[PDB]
Amino acid sequence: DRFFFIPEEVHILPESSAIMVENYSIIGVDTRITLNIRSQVGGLIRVERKKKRIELKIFSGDIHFPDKTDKI
Amino acid sequence: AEYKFPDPIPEFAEAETKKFRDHMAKKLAKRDLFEDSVDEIVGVCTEIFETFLRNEYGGPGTLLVIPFIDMADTLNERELPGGPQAARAAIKWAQDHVDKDWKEWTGTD
């Protein structure tokens, strides 16, 4: 009766691609990712390097910080 | 080899602190919750944020939440109103400006 759709921007790139965004960096809309690729949405940047490819994800949302009593 | 973050730039900290203080003064004045303690809260806000930028901030990936946690605690310890609200306003401005301004200041992508 309800279905969900989280928006995530994922770029699968070759290992030799030049990445111009740092890991855990916050980028805005239209931020250049590679020489020919620009980000469509803004958020946190996560770069995962695999054996032959680089997986880059852009996570939209609000960044929150835990408290001492935060039982998350 | 543990990655070594770039050293904090005192000149960048001074420029960002002035921008942070101006935004806090304009933002906190619009709320009646702070009343007559706007200047004191902003002054306490300016001090902690300036200290973090001078000593610990080294660019993207170093914007810690601890100074903003200290923001709510210090105001609450001094019995100043709007502790969490002032810290929330400060952390929202930092998320939108601090990392971007460091890249412009240093010329790094």
Side-chain angles (χ1 to χ4, degrees):
Chain A
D1 289 333
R2 209 169 277 130
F3 82 92
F4 307 93
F5 163 65
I6 78 191
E8 290 187 1
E9 181 178 349
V10 177
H11 294 279
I12 301 178
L13 305 161
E15 188 178 5
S16 59
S17 290
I19 312 300
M20 308 112 93
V21 286
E22 288 195 356
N23 199 22
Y24 298 115
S25 69
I26 315 160
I27 66 162
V29 191
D30 201 36
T31 297
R32 199 169 287 173
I33 305 298
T34 71
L35 283 172
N36 303 334
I37 297 175
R38 298 185 71 93
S39 66
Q40 297 297 329
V41 309
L44 182 78
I45 285 283
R46 182 173 181 180
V47 181
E48 288 187 0
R49 289 186 175 118
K50 294 185 179 176
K51 255 187 179 173
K52 296 183 182 176
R53 297 171 185 180
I54 301 171
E55 200 181 4
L56 192 139
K57 300 180 181 181
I58 310 181
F59 305 101
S60 62
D62 294 330
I63 292 172
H64 288 253
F65 303 90
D67 213 352
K68 272 184 182 177
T69 57
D70 256 349
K71 273 198 175 181
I72 297 169
Chain B
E2 224 184 359
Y3 179 79
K4 187 180 180 180
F5 295 97
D7 292 319
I9 301 172
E11 293 84 5
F12 171 81
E14 286 179 5
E16 203 76 8
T17 302
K18 185 178 176 177
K19 299 179 189 174
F20 171 78
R21 182 178 182 255
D22 285 346
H23 170 83
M24 289 298 286
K26 291 177 188 176
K27 182 75 171 185
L28 300 191
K30 295 179 183 178
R31 298 196 175 195
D32 298 336
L33 181 70
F34 306 101
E35 294 181 357
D36 303 333
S37 303
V38 178
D39 285 334
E40 186 178 2
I41 289 160
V42 166
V44 176
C45 285
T46 296
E47 185 181 354
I48 293 174
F49 194 58
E50 185 176 1
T51 307
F52 159 70
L53 291 180
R54 284 185 177 271
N55 299 323
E56 293 178 61
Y57 186 74
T62 62
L63 181 57
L64 301 178
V65 77
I66 293 293
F68 309 108
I69 300 174
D70 292 337
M71 206 48 95
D73 292 351
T74 310
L75 298 177
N76 286 341
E77 285 169 8
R78 294 186 184 196
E79 298 186 356
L80 292 167
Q85 287 84 354
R88 177 176 179 184
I91 197 166
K92 277 185 177 181
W93 182 88
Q95 282 170 306
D96 297 343
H97 297 275
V98 169
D99 280 354
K100 181 182 65 179
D101 290 349
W102 176 275
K103 289 182 183 177
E104 294 171 5
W105 186 284
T106 63
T108 48
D109 274 355

